[PDB]
Design a protein around this ligand. Structure first.
Ligand SMILES: C[C@@H](Sc1nc2c(cnn2C)c(=O)n1-c1ccc(CO)cc1)c1ccccc1
Ligand SMILES: C[C@@H](Sc1nc2c(cnn2C)c(=O)n1-c1ccc(CO)cc1)c1ccccc1
Ligand SMILES: [Cl-]
Ligand SMILES: [Cl-]
Ligand SMILES: [Cl-]
Ligand SMILES: [Cl-]
Ligand SMILES: [Yb+3]
Ligand SMILES: [Yb+3]
Ligand SMILES: [Yb+3]
Ligand SMILES: [Yb+3]
Lengths: 494, 494, 494, 494
């Protein structure tokens, strides 16, 4: 069931959100927000800079003070607020999915059925953790009573990318709020709008003022202000590995703020000769092509055993030739645009290297349309490891298919990258599934599937694909700070 | 019972330890090691530089490869090796404590009774965790079987300070080895010797080659090589907050390696009017004066309620006047030297600011002896918050005593620092003990005691006193990397 | 804010609830349900017997089969159903509290403000656990992959008492359903009605049929059928220790079904001379007198240090003389009736022993009113340990106050009972609070309070006050059955 | 490497062990201990009865008192004592294995290489848990500080079977002691001797007196005394399901003591057509024939798919015909005797039913030798579900092989038993391995193996095969009793 919005969407929220009120920028500047499918300006939004991030941090700090409503409320009540926010996002599902589709260049069916469903489910999952974050009592040596408090860390700076704006917003704020933190969020310059609507719902839900502050604007200004701030306790960032390195460096230089990073990948799939071939083709296909290839987990190197390689390439190419490009809001359209010019250019430039460096172009490999940042869905076979398209994250609808005959060697090739976000293994063999997934240097390893994400699992990168994990039980640890309290007593008993 | 070594100690191990064999430096240079009590050269040690760290990382990487003895052995057997290492350290307790005392300027009674006891106990504690590191099975949405592996991270670079060389060595290698990591250790330039003896015991215990590699040398060369290395997966560092910032920055610039930091402090004690006064004086005293003040947790700001302040200062001063300075090896001696000239100078310079900025000198405040980096035990009363001695870590035998009358205000003053390693609260009031310890922004809060450390507790800093925790159950998480494995199935059942 | 129902309550649901449909009894018999305040018949309800429990178990077994909707739905969806049930109970709060008050003899202010609030909050807490129940991956010796599944146990028989009918219903079904079990509930013969309304809401919420089955009737028939059934996997019971022993015996005789028991108590309070006296009097008062003394945790032995004993008794007696007896539905009424004749008789008989055995009657000690099972609120001082009123659970509004001078001896006296549900300690001394609470053989120990219950804490008895725990993280374990899966592999890696 | 004892074994310890001293029985009676291979009397042992169990419980109770050495020692020191006991068992490995072989009828190679290795490893595993048993700090509603203590339960009565006397002794005492309990152990009447030697080593290791008490004797006297004792807090029993029911009943009747049971089985294997046939034959073979079939996990129903059934039966029969019967002490001997006459008779009687009820006798099916309780290794093919040999636990060297063609139906047949200790699944199919192991109602499910037991895994039965789990992290919970401590505070902060 794919319902739709009956009136044309109006944009309402375009201001900086601090202490549950709407602020003009300190400078008074505003910046335009575009639709990637039409190249048309949707609206303008208040440009947050260092001066605005400073207001936002001061409000977050005040909301975190000992004795404040947010610090003193029952953990169960933090949970209640989060489940209420999920109910409000569910109420505004049509509006939010439409705004998400229009601003993000994101197919509406997927926006409504997947992105919004995941947002609501992740929030409800995090709500449930709030009053289940626990420390320990510890049988220390000597006559002492020792316990630990898993406290909130404090003011968390949270920088969100443009590829899944709502999902990424909730992946940040859900766990941070569940644990009792206050946040300063910087949504992507390309996609501020859905986050500003969520801010209106945070107010409506009744979160105390200053617990969530949202400062739209650019990365090199508002994002740098966050990463270098002397009174932000933690920065969480999802985006490029390049910017990830700047974030971690700036945290080091400033106040040694805690860092988690969810970065890019060059994620490999290994398809064994005994694999269910159609299943492997279908998952590897969606694994690389989902949301116009703009996923950090993009299955951008597919190694297939030689005896099934030709059949794999043939079936993959036929699947890639089935797309219908267009405005992501029109029903039946199955591929929207890339987010912007910068990305569009990078994608086309990398497509040209595949041709020049000698990969076999099976289909696509150029642009589409008179308007909008559209790239034809592209497949390269006979890709080799030193090619640019095998080493660099494309972040576009461009599939690479490689051959292998040695399992020892293809695991080395899979692991021979600075990335390590995820990987896929396709086989019917129990031993192969376990041993290969153990040997892959990847944060998530899918077996006979790909791109299966859920709130109950931790998610994050090995190596330069990330630091730390988001979601699951394990992800909640990185939004707590552990305090040991050791009390002298006359005599302990076990 | 304080037994002693019957023969004069000979130094045997002075070389770089890689793949369980002793190496000369690549350059061929060596550097001198001194006794801080006599200023005399004890020996020379091979100077590890970038070229040597490179050999050490290659060996650690090879020992970590899938299919290696260290990766394939039973977790229970990693545990067994660690308990064997503890038995060997216990066997060599006299030798190790003597070498630790002589090289570190550390009182021998404390070296033997505390440092070595803590080393052995921490190793035995970590051994027990080895086969109890577990992932999860997770009821993900959809028809999937999801589990997680809490894998070792990989090659861990571990930089150790000079103040507790053996304890800090074991705090690093115990958890890292228990979890299945391989390590490259850089002991302090001042104190390489006890670590090199432990390396001989790692060989004797039967650890596979390359699992522990020890590279002595300087910080700006060997330490920088570690922090900037493109194939070290994690750096752990204990030391100054200043160097901590360089470590985190370099990790960011290079390969986004995981970082934990245990840094300095300016740790406060709050002594309420209802406190057991003698107990508060005794613990605050040892809290600041332990190991010539060379503890990151040094209780270097003692806030005392006004009505008991005079009596507190009087009793504290009398306790500080009871010390006997000398060579840390002579029985009855109760205060050894500072580690080196750099520290000695910093301590005296800060003592001079206390005088100049207007603190009341109660006792001490100059050097002692014709040889050795000795500082008289010093007490300042009427210290105020803007003084250098109230803001900067002294790392010397220098106590600061402050007065307060308002509990709200003294908690602000306690928290008004970029540090946050630890704190002390002294009171008989149940409510005060709980509420004050909750409000303090400190990693460990002691109630009616100070400096109670044990292997079962997590330990680390809030704010610029650290990132992450060492020891306890919680500390073991930062030596694992979490992998989610998600397997497609026909139908799941709860 | 105490709102009320605008129309007089009508009873609608009076039938046995199996497979989400309403059933007449197999025999066709019905049994009367009374109001304890008027002694008047409210209605008749279908009498479940062994033959009906058999239908209910068959439905629960079918709902638990591998491949069923309840076994195959997402854990997150079990959670969703539970949060929906909580929303429906919140919607029907006025109706449920009124029915609870009228059928249970329970003061309406408390029914509405506490019982219903606790029901809703406990359900919401349990909902949050559903998709957070996890097994482990385990580094077993040898070349194996080992994981565990924390499965639901299966069909759980759940026997509920009359004193907190709704709260006890939700304490049973919340965790059992969160974990994926199916249930056969036997509410108390005195109080079937609110549970049958909840059954209508379980249907409305959309729980699959057979997941919850409710069989009203008597204990020696329907309760015995449950405890002795060959295809019930687990029995959970709250009630008398006497019946608890019959339940455990019958489980042993039949099919070794798993057992948890929440039984009675003779819970002690220790009031030290340094205690906040008014706080200790107020909490000890409500600790014994709550819900006409019909709490398993009733603070039915209050030991007070001699120097404050007289003042404690005086203040307690004045507090007990402030009650207004009457129909629990009338505003301003502060004490309702006992549940029934059996209990009423037992209470009066025990009150007579206090007089005869030589306790000092301070106030009360007889019945009240022309109708309804009312007992005057009673206080005995100078109670000694061999008295019946100091050994036996009264379950009525009858307080016992004792004196002590030796802390060693009063802890022995506190622990000198076969019971062990809970206890209270009142002191300002940190050491006393910790050491006394450690030494008490009680499941919950309150310090400077009493009767503080919350969903986040485990709750249950030491000794003959119970087996196992309900609620908290820990309580959820007893609604899972652990399966270890060990898979042969060619080679494991850490 | 199978070394042996150089002198003939002498029996030294034959007395009741209470408070670390050797006691004659209260009656003064003694009972004979036999070698099952020769039918010859080895010695006499003091017969413990109710009067002796009473002495043992009083000593255990005193060792558990608040303030005792066992309650006040560091958890790390409980661990140390356990690792010391493991070292002493390792020292006496030859003596213990020989005594175990001679008294238990247990093949010496297995006694030395498996039983003693498992004893030592399990103890070392449990030692590591001692100072890692932790409670929680819990964010309860309202202004309270809540924590939990995972205390030892108290005096644990532990009844051990004859089939693995040392392993079962350590499986009981290891976790119970690690958690801080005191124990009264009743080893099997057939096999008291190795436990009494371990008692001498508990004394030598330096356990405080009364922490471990061992009372040899019979089950219907000493075992009943334990199960019905009013001051034993918990009973743990491994043995027959029949006696298991008596234990649970008696706990119910007496003092509602906590119960865990590890009972018998009729454990099934499902061998799919795609299985590695030789691996399935080898593991199913050892799965049923290990230790003369005297394992609770005996793979006593092997369901094989029809197309490989004939080949499976043929290969299995050839493997069963390779045994060499004799005294378990002679090298090359590969099958020892049954434990005693009672078991021997039961085995032969059940073998006769297989013949009479129409199973196909492939080999064996009678006794062997002039002396010793020897049974020929027996294989029945064409077994059907209503046969006695398919329903009843034989506990002898008797294999049952069945055919199936429907996977749905063979899972029903596998699950169609009151037992549920363990099961085996043999297949190369990933989906089959996961789905079948999920659907089996068995505590341990092995995939492509059988009888893989390790200290790191929990172990126990579904249904009438047991209550609770032993070993792993999960097993340690059943040796703790949880206390919630809830402290009133002025104001909480997260
Ligand atoms: C919307 C999905 S997330 C999701 N779904 C995908 C990707 C590629 N194909 N599909 C179907 C995909 O890349 N994601 C995804 C988005 C963000 C992050 C972390 O930054 C990780 C993954 C979700 C969110 C929340 C709960 C459940 C599912
Ligand atoms: C030797 C101690 S550690 C110890 N003891 C002290 C300090 C000041 N006074 N005392 C008595 C003190 O500062 N330490 C200490 C040393 C290192 C670290 C982490 O880098 C933390 C603390 C120990 C080690 C291991 C187990 C138990 C105790
Ligand atoms: Cl912790
Ligand atoms: Cl995890
Ligand atoms: Cl488990
Ligand atoms: Cl708990
Ligand atoms: Yb264009
Ligand atoms: Yb000098
Ligand atoms: Yb009457
Ligand atoms: Yb015979």
């Amino acid at each position: 069931d794919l319902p739709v919005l009956l009136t044309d969407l109006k944009i309402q929220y375009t201001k900086i959100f601090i202490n549950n009120e709407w602020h003009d920028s300190v400078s008074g500047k505003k910046f335009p927000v575009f639709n990637p499918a039409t190249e048309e300006e949707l609206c303008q939004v208040e440009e947050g800079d260092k001066e605005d991030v400073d207001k936002a941090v001061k409000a977050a700090r005040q909301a975190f003070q000992i004795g404040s409503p947010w610090r003193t409320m029952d953990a169960s009540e933090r949970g209640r607020l989060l489940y209420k926010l999920a109910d409000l996002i569910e109420r505004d599902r049509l509006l939010l999915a439409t705004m998400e589709s229009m601003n993000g260049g994101k197919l509406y069916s997927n926006a409504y059925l997947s992105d919004l469903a995941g947002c609501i489910k992740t929030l409800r999952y995090c709500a449930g953790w709030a009053d289940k974050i626990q420390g320990r009592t510890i049988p220390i040596d000597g006559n002492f009573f020792t316990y630990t408090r898993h406290e909130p860390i404090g003011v968390c700076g949270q920088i969100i990318p443009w590829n899944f704006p709502l999902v990424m917003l909730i992946w940040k704020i859900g766990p941070a709020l569940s644990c009792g933190n206050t946040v300063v969020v910087k949504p992507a310059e390309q996609t501020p709008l859905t986050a500003l609507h969520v801010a209106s719902l945070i107010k409506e839900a009744g979160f105390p003022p200053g617990v969530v502050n949202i400062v739209p604007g650019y990365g090199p200004t508002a994002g740098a202000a966050i990463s270098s701030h002397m009174d932000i306790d933690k920065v969480a960032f999802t985006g490029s590995t390049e910017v990830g390195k700047l974030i971690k460096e700036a945290a080091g230089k400033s106040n040694l703020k805690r860092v988690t990073l969810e970065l890019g990948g060059k994620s490999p799939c290994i398809v064994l000769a005994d694999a269910d071939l159609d299943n492997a083709v279908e998952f590897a296909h969606h694994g690389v092509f989902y949301h116009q290839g703009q996923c950090c987990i993009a299955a951008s190197r597919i190694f297939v055993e030689e005896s099934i390689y030709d059949e794999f390439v043939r079936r993959s190419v036929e699947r890639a030739k089935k797309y219908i490009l267009g405005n992501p809001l029109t029903p039946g359209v199955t591929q929207g645009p890339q987010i912007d010019k910068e990305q569009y250019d990078k994608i086309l430039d990398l497509i040209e290297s595949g041709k020049k460096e000698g990969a076999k172009l099976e289909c696509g490999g150029g642009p589409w349309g008179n308007k909008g940042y559209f790239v034809q869905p592209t497949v390269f076979s006979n890709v080799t490891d030193e090619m640019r398209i095998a080493k660099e994250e494309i972040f576009g609808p461009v599939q690479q298919i490689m051959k292998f005959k040695s399992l020892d060697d293809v695991i080395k090739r899979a692991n021979n990258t600075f990335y390590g976000l995820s990987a896929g293994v396709f086989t019917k063999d129990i031993d192969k599934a376990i041993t290969i997934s153990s040997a892959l240097q990847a944060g998530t390893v899918w077996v006979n599937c790909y791109g299966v994400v859920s709130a109950q699992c931790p998610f994050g990168g090995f190596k330069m694909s990330g630091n730390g994990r988001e979601l699951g039980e394990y992800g909640f640890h990185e939004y707590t700070e552990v305090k040991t309290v050791t009390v002298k007593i006359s005599q302990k008993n076990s």
